[PDB]
Design a protein around this ligand. Sequence first.
Ligand SMILES: Cc1nc(C)c([C@H](C)NC(=O)C(C)C)s1
Ligand SMILES: [Cl-]
Ligand SMILES: [Zn+2]
Ligand SMILES: [Zn+2]
Length: 573
Amino acid sequence: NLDIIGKRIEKIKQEHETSWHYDQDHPYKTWAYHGSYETKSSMVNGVVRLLTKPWDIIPMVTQMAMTKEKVDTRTQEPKEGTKKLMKITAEWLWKELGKKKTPRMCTREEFTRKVRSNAALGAIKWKSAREAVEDSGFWELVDKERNLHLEGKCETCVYNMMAIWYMWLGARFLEFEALGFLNEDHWFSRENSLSGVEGEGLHKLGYILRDVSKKEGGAMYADDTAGWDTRITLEDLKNEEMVTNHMEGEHKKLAEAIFKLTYQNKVVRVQRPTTVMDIISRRDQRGSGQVVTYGLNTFTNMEAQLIRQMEGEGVFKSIQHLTVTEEIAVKNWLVRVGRERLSRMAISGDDCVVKPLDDRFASALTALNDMGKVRKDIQQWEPSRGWNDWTQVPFCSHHFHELIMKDGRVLVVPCRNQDELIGRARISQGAGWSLRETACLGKSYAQMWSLMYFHRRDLRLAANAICSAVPSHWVPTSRHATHEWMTTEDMLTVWNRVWIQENPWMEDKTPVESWEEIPYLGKREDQWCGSLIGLTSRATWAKNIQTAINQVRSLIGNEEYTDYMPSMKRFRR
Ligand SMILES: Cc1nc(C)c([C@H](C)NC(=O)C(C)C)s1
Ligand SMILES: [Cl-]
Ligand SMILES: [Zn+2]
Ligand SMILES: [Zn+2]
């Protein structure tokens, strides 16, 4: 307790010596409260909304632009049988992930190149992080903490709640220096991890789920966890920490300090309106950078799902206690079939799809519930409902269609309800957007649609309209996945590269010569997934689209524009 966190708490105490009041009516039960002190939205993208008029009267779209008791919860300690299963599996999984990779420190140079590329780090003297990385004074502050961690102590690595846990750039750098390698060197790539999809891209995920469907076995299971980050136990944090067993030198010590001082023993500042700032501590639950969070969520999810698979195959009888011979059976299962069982999964942080050996998996719930990974929207002991068709499985907020081109070649495409896509593209975050910056964000959404959602009639039409309304040479902007749409290259050339040339599931590499060779879903299947095709509002929009494009061109002014509407058959004469 207070020996590891007290030094951080002491320093905050003094900075607000005038206001250090202990509010006896503090709402925390699970969080350990220390003291208080005195302290004191989604905007619409006008370019995308003017070019999607029919959606102005659809509440699922228009409500998206308008407008905890899970963090303050406790998770019971797992049984001894469960703790053994997790330790054996985690030991085995780090070794497997480490067979073709070498842990290493990430550099100030690498960090500095990420801040100048507008990468989301979650950071709180210096206005922006760019100024701080340029100032040696910042690196002087980083050095002091760096030497504190080598000494096994912490002073400034404190979380700020808002769920997102922002920290000071110095603590974020020290996290990146010690654990950035997991993402920077692609540990959770499909090639390395077999279950992972880090770096894949939305265009790949459907092909990956269809490859899992090809395995002999039972239903496809896709159970969501209720509040995954809140269910991470101190036992889970200990199993994650075993990556340090593969390290050496300074790196081993720096990594051991991140896990010990900032992950397994936290300090957090939360704003309570009654406005004051509360300084609370807790050892369990997930509270890290979003990028390290992603890789450790993937690791711990892979572990939990291999154990659920062991339970269904009868590898162990009870979570109460593993016998000596069950330990050897579990290790032997992992050595003999572990890699095959990893390939039966697609795991993206807390999100999973599993095609187990058979449907015994559906009712194998004792280890999953005892690890604290309780399923969302089903009773604790009711068996999981599986999917019989890979095209119906949810994964990473999508489902996937099999779409046959006029020339016979097969595309596997990502999809989701079209109201969600249009509603998201109509929102921008933050202040001080120029008309040009707003336009360039609309262009990013439009190019994303031409590449990923070209098969949805409304989105190919709206994408063509937005690209016709925004000056041809303006560069799309965006104030685990691949962003091929962020470019000024011709979108037909990018489509050919992504879906044909670089597609490992497409044997015939014949280029497509025009957008009219590129198919849509069935009219009925487009309506099922939210198309307005068939409505009078939509027909009038499509027919009069040049009027909408011209409205937006008149607002932006006398710039160079291209007409992309004749790429579609109906505007081709
Ligand atoms: C299908 C998508 N994949 C990723 C990674 C997206 C990002 C977050 N969003 C964007 O690039 C928008 C500004 C268009 S959308
Ligand atoms: Cl189904
Ligand atoms: Zn620290
Ligand atoms: Zn669909």
